[PDB]
Amino acid sequence: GCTRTCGGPKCTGTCTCTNSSKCGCRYNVHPSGWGCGCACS
């Protein structure tokens, strides 16, 4: 199965999913909902 882990200082982390390649945690600072989570690109 895939993997998702986060909990860094400035909202960060690491993620790995066979479905994708370049995965990882990202922090959103937009007005339309903010927060940091795991997302691939």
Domains in the chain: boundaries: 1-28
2-34: buried (b, 16+ CB within 10 Å) or exposed (e) per residue? eebebeeeebebebeeeeeeebebbeeeeeeee
- Interatomic CA distance for residues 21 and 2, integer angstroms: 11
Residue 24: which of 33, 35, 12 has the closest Cα? 12
